[PDB]
Amino acid sequence: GSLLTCGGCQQNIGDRYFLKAIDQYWHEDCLSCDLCGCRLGEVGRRLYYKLGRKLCRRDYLRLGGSGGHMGSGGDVMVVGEPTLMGGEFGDEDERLITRLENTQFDAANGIDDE
Ligand SMILES: [Zn+2]
Ligand SMILES: [Zn+2]
């Protein structure tokens, strides 16, 4: 039933896996980005968010940072590589949420629990 509550849909996390870090709990497909429209970086480490926004550093950099361009990343030769392309970098200290498991991870119904 109801174990944790996600801050994205707030419909409770009865899943087997779940994500959390900001200050509350989330969902795997709920914890998305605000403005870039990506999916941060689900490699548990640090996290980047504002007072009341789960907005990226690059998102924050797009309006109140130093970017606001198309070419994102570090200024390096364009060979078709991730991150390093322009100026609005990536993560490292960004929303690297910890992909955790639920206490009732059981999963009595496959990708659905009781
Ligand atoms: Zn949710
Ligand atoms: Zn973003």
Coordinates of N, CA and C and ligand atoms in Angstrom, one line a residue:
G1 N 0.8 -1.2 0.0 CA 0.0 0.0 0.0 C 0.8 1.3 0.0
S2 N 0.5 2.2 0.8 CA 1.2 3.5 0.9 C 2.4 3.4 1.8
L3 N 3.6 3.6 1.3 CA 4.8 3.6 2.1 C 5.5 4.9 2.2
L4 N 5.9 5.4 1.0 CA 6.5 6.7 0.9 C 5.6 7.6 0.0
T5 N 5.8 8.9 0.0 CA 5.1 9.7 -0.9 C 6.0 10.6 -1.8
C6 N 5.8 10.5 -3.1 CA 6.6 11.2 -4.0 C 6.1 12.7 -4.2
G7 N 7.1 13.5 -4.5 CA 6.7 15.0 -4.5 C 6.4 15.4 -5.9
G8 N 6.4 14.5 -6.9 CA 6.1 14.8 -8.2 C 4.7 14.6 -8.6
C9 N 4.2 13.5 -8.2 CA 2.8 13.2 -8.5 C 2.0 13.1 -7.2
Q10 N 2.7 12.9 -6.1 CA 2.1 12.8 -4.7 C 1.1 11.7 -4.6
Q11 N 1.2 10.7 -5.5 CA 0.2 9.6 -5.4 C 0.7 8.4 -4.6
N12 N 1.8 8.7 -3.9 CA 2.4 7.6 -3.0 C 3.3 6.7 -3.9
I13 N 4.4 6.2 -3.3 CA 5.3 5.3 -4.0 C 5.1 3.9 -3.4
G14 N 4.3 3.1 -4.2 CA 4.1 1.7 -3.8 C 4.9 0.8 -4.7
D15 N 5.9 1.4 -5.3 CA 6.8 0.7 -6.3 C 7.8 -0.2 -5.6
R16 N 8.6 -0.9 -6.4 CA 9.7 -1.7 -5.8 C 11.0 -0.9 -5.7
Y17 N 11.1 0.0 -6.6 CA 12.3 0.9 -6.6 C 11.8 2.4 -6.5
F18 N 12.6 3.3 -6.0 CA 12.2 4.7 -5.8 C 13.4 5.6 -5.7
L19 N 13.1 6.8 -5.9 CA 14.2 7.8 -5.9 C 13.9 8.9 -4.9
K20 N 14.9 9.4 -4.2 CA 14.7 10.4 -3.2 C 16.1 11.1 -2.9
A21 N 16.0 12.4 -2.5 CA 17.3 13.1 -2.2 C 17.0 14.6 -1.8
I22 N 16.2 15.3 -2.5 CA 15.9 16.7 -2.3 C 15.6 17.0 -0.8
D23 N 14.6 16.3 -0.3 CA 14.1 16.5 1.1 C 12.9 15.6 1.3
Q24 N 12.4 15.1 0.2 CA 11.3 14.2 0.2 C 11.6 13.0 -0.7
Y25 N 10.5 12.2 -1.0 CA 10.7 11.0 -1.8 C 10.1 11.2 -3.2
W26 N 10.5 10.5 -4.1 CA 10.1 10.6 -5.5 C 9.8 9.3 -6.2
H27 N 9.6 9.4 -7.5 CA 9.4 8.2 -8.3 C 10.5 8.2 -9.4
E28 N 10.7 7.0 -10.0 CA 11.7 6.9 -11.1 C 11.4 7.7 -12.3
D29 N 10.1 7.7 -12.7 CA 9.7 8.4 -13.9 C 9.1 9.8 -13.5
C30 N 9.1 10.1 -12.2 CA 8.5 11.3 -11.8 C 9.6 12.3 -11.6
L31 N 10.8 11.9 -11.1 CA 11.9 12.8 -10.9 C 12.6 13.2 -12.3
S32 N 11.9 14.1 -13.0 CA 12.5 14.6 -14.2 C 13.0 16.0 -14.0
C33 N 13.5 16.6 -15.1 CA 14.1 17.9 -15.0 C 13.0 18.9 -15.2
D34 N 13.3 20.2 -14.9 CA 12.3 21.2 -14.9 C 12.2 22.0 -16.3
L35 N 13.4 22.3 -16.8 CA 13.5 23.2 -18.0 C 14.2 22.6 -19.2
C36 N 15.4 22.0 -19.0 CA 16.1 21.3 -20.1 C 15.2 20.2 -20.7
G37 N 14.5 19.5 -19.8 CA 13.7 18.4 -20.2 C 14.5 17.1 -20.5
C38 N 15.4 16.8 -19.6 CA 16.2 15.7 -19.7 C 15.9 14.6 -18.6
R39 N 16.8 14.3 -17.8 CA 16.6 13.4 -16.7 C 17.8 13.4 -15.7
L40 N 18.3 14.6 -15.5 CA 19.4 14.8 -14.5 C 20.6 13.8 -14.7
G41 N 20.8 13.0 -13.7 CA 21.8 12.0 -13.7 C 21.7 11.1 -12.6
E42 N 20.9 10.0 -12.7 CA 20.6 9.1 -11.7 C 21.8 8.2 -11.2
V43 N 22.9 8.9 -10.9 CA 24.1 8.2 -10.3 C 24.4 8.8 -8.9
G44 N 23.8 8.2 -7.9 CA 23.8 8.7 -6.6 C 25.1 9.3 -6.1
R45 N 25.0 10.6 -5.9 CA 26.2 11.4 -5.5 C 25.7 12.7 -4.8
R46 N 25.7 13.7 -5.6 CA 25.2 15.0 -5.1 C 23.8 15.3 -5.6
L47 N 23.4 16.6 -5.4 CA 22.1 17.0 -6.0 C 22.1 18.5 -6.1
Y48 N 21.4 19.0 -7.1 CA 21.2 20.4 -7.4 C 19.8 20.8 -7.6
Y49 N 19.4 21.7 -6.7 CA 18.0 22.2 -6.7 C 17.9 23.5 -6.0
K50 N 16.9 24.3 -6.3 CA 16.7 25.6 -5.7 C 15.7 25.6 -4.6
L51 N 15.6 26.7 -3.8 CA 14.7 26.8 -2.7 C 13.4 26.0 -2.8
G52 N 12.7 26.3 -3.9 CA 11.4 25.6 -4.1 C 11.3 25.0 -5.5
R53 N 12.4 24.8 -6.2 CA 12.4 24.3 -7.5 C 13.4 23.2 -7.7
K54 N 13.0 22.1 -8.2 CA 13.9 21.0 -8.6 C 14.5 21.2 -10.0
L55 N 15.1 22.4 -10.1 CA 15.6 22.8 -11.4 C 17.2 22.6 -11.4
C56 N 17.7 22.3 -12.6 CA 19.1 22.0 -12.7 C 19.9 23.2 -12.6
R57 N 21.2 23.0 -12.4 CA 22.2 24.1 -12.4 C 22.3 24.7 -13.8
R58 N 22.2 23.8 -14.8 CA 22.2 24.3 -16.2 C 20.9 25.1 -16.5
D59 N 19.8 24.7 -15.9 CA 18.6 25.4 -16.0 C 18.7 26.7 -15.4
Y60 N 19.2 26.7 -14.2 CA 19.4 27.9 -13.4 C 20.5 28.8 -14.1
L61 N 21.4 28.1 -14.8 CA 22.5 28.8 -15.5 C 21.9 29.4 -16.8
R62 N 20.8 29.0 -17.2 CA 20.2 29.4 -18.5 C 19.4 30.7 -18.3
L63 N 19.1 31.1 -17.1 CA 18.4 32.3 -16.8 C 19.1 33.2 -15.9
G64 N 19.7 32.6 -14.8 CA 20.5 33.4 -13.9 C 21.8 32.8 -13.7
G65 N 22.5 32.4 -14.7 CA 23.8 31.9 -14.6 C 24.7 32.6 -15.6
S66 N 25.2 31.9 -16.6 CA 26.1 32.5 -17.6 C 25.8 32.0 -19.0
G67 N 24.8 31.2 -19.1 CA 24.5 30.6 -20.4 C 23.3 31.2 -21.1
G68 N 22.3 30.4 -21.5 CA 21.2 30.9 -22.3 C 21.5 30.8 -23.7
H69 N 22.2 29.7 -24.1 CA 22.6 29.4 -25.5 C 22.1 28.0 -25.9
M70 N 22.5 27.6 -27.1 CA 22.2 26.3 -27.5 C 23.3 25.3 -27.3
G71 N 24.5 25.7 -27.6 CA 25.7 24.8 -27.4 C 26.0 24.7 -25.9
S72 N 25.8 23.5 -25.4 CA 26.0 23.3 -24.0 C 27.3 22.4 -23.8
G73 N 27.8 22.5 -22.6 CA 29.0 21.7 -22.2 C 30.2 22.6 -22.1
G74 N 31.4 22.0 -22.2 CA 32.6 22.7 -22.2 C 33.1 23.0 -23.6
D75 N 33.8 24.1 -23.8 CA 34.2 24.6 -25.1 C 35.3 23.7 -25.6
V76 N 35.0 22.7 -26.4 CA 36.0 21.8 -27.0 C 35.6 21.5 -28.4
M77 N 36.6 20.9 -29.2 CA 36.4 20.6 -30.6 C 35.1 19.7 -30.7
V78 N 34.3 20.0 -31.6 CA 33.0 19.3 -31.9 C 33.3 18.0 -32.6
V79 N 33.4 16.9 -31.9 CA 33.6 15.6 -32.5 C 32.4 14.7 -32.4
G80 N 31.3 15.3 -31.8 CA 30.1 14.5 -31.6 C 30.1 13.8 -30.2
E81 N 30.6 14.6 -29.2 CA 30.7 14.0 -27.9 C 29.7 14.6 -26.9
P82 N 29.3 14.0 -25.8 CA 28.4 14.5 -24.8 C 29.0 15.6 -24.0
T83 N 28.2 16.4 -23.3 CA 28.7 17.5 -22.5 C 29.5 18.5 -23.3
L84 N 30.8 18.4 -23.2 CA 31.7 19.4 -23.8 C 31.3 19.7 -25.3
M85 N 30.6 20.8 -25.5 CA 30.3 21.3 -26.8 C 30.3 22.8 -26.8
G86 N 29.6 23.4 -25.8 CA 29.5 24.9 -25.8 C 30.0 25.5 -24.5
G87 N 29.0 25.9 -23.6 CA 29.4 26.6 -22.4 C 28.6 26.2 -21.2
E88 N 27.3 25.8 -21.4 CA 26.4 25.5 -20.3 C 26.6 24.0 -20.0
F89 N 27.5 23.7 -19.0 CA 28.0 22.4 -18.7 C 27.0 21.4 -18.3
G90 N 27.4 20.3 -17.6 CA 26.5 19.2 -17.3 C 26.2 19.1 -15.8
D91 N 26.7 18.1 -15.2 CA 26.4 17.8 -13.8 C 27.6 17.8 -12.9
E92 N 28.0 16.6 -12.4 CA 29.0 16.3 -11.5 C 28.6 16.7 -10.0
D93 N 28.0 17.8 -9.9 CA 27.4 18.3 -8.6 C 25.9 18.5 -8.7
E94 N 25.4 18.1 -9.9 CA 23.9 18.3 -10.2 C 23.1 17.3 -9.5
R95 N 21.8 17.2 -10.0 CA 20.8 16.3 -9.4 C 21.1 14.8 -9.6
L96 N 22.1 14.3 -8.9 CA 22.5 12.9 -8.9 C 21.8 12.1 -7.8
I97 N 20.5 11.8 -8.1 CA 19.7 11.2 -7.1 C 20.1 9.7 -6.9
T98 N 19.9 9.2 -5.7 CA 20.2 7.9 -5.3 C 19.1 6.9 -5.6
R99 N 19.3 6.1 -6.6 CA 18.2 5.2 -7.0 C 18.1 4.1 -5.9
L100 N 17.1 4.2 -5.1 CA 17.0 3.3 -3.9 C 15.9 2.3 -4.2
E101 N 15.7 1.4 -3.2 CA 14.6 0.4 -3.3 C 13.6 0.6 -2.1
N102 N 12.4 0.2 -2.4 CA 11.4 0.4 -1.4 C 11.5 -0.7 -0.3
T103 N 11.0 -0.4 0.9 CA 11.0 -1.4 2.0 C 10.2 -2.6 1.6
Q104 N 9.1 -2.4 1.0 CA 8.3 -3.4 0.5 C 8.6 -3.6 -1.0
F105 N 9.8 -3.9 -1.3 CA 10.3 -4.0 -2.7 C 9.7 -5.3 -3.3
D106 N 9.4 -6.2 -2.4 CA 8.8 -7.5 -2.7 C 8.4 -7.7 -4.2
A107 N 7.4 -6.9 -4.6 CA 6.9 -6.9 -6.0 C 6.1 -8.2 -6.3
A108 N 5.0 -8.3 -5.5 CA 4.2 -9.5 -5.6 C 3.5 -9.7 -6.9
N109 N 3.4 -8.6 -7.7 CA 2.8 -8.7 -9.0 C 3.7 -8.2 -10.1
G110 N 4.9 -8.6 -10.1 CA 5.9 -8.2 -11.1 C 6.4 -6.8 -10.9
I111 N 6.0 -5.9 -11.7 CA 6.3 -4.5 -11.5 C 5.1 -3.8 -10.8
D112 N 4.6 -4.4 -9.8 CA 3.5 -3.9 -9.0 C 3.4 -4.7 -7.7
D113 N 3.2 -4.0 -6.6 CA 3.2 -4.6 -5.3 C 1.8 -4.5 -4.6
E114 N 1.7 -5.2 -3.5 CA 0.5 -5.1 -2.7 C 0.7 -4.3 -1.5
Ligands
ZN1 ZN 5.3 10.1 -8.4
ZN2 ZN 17.1 20.7 -16.4

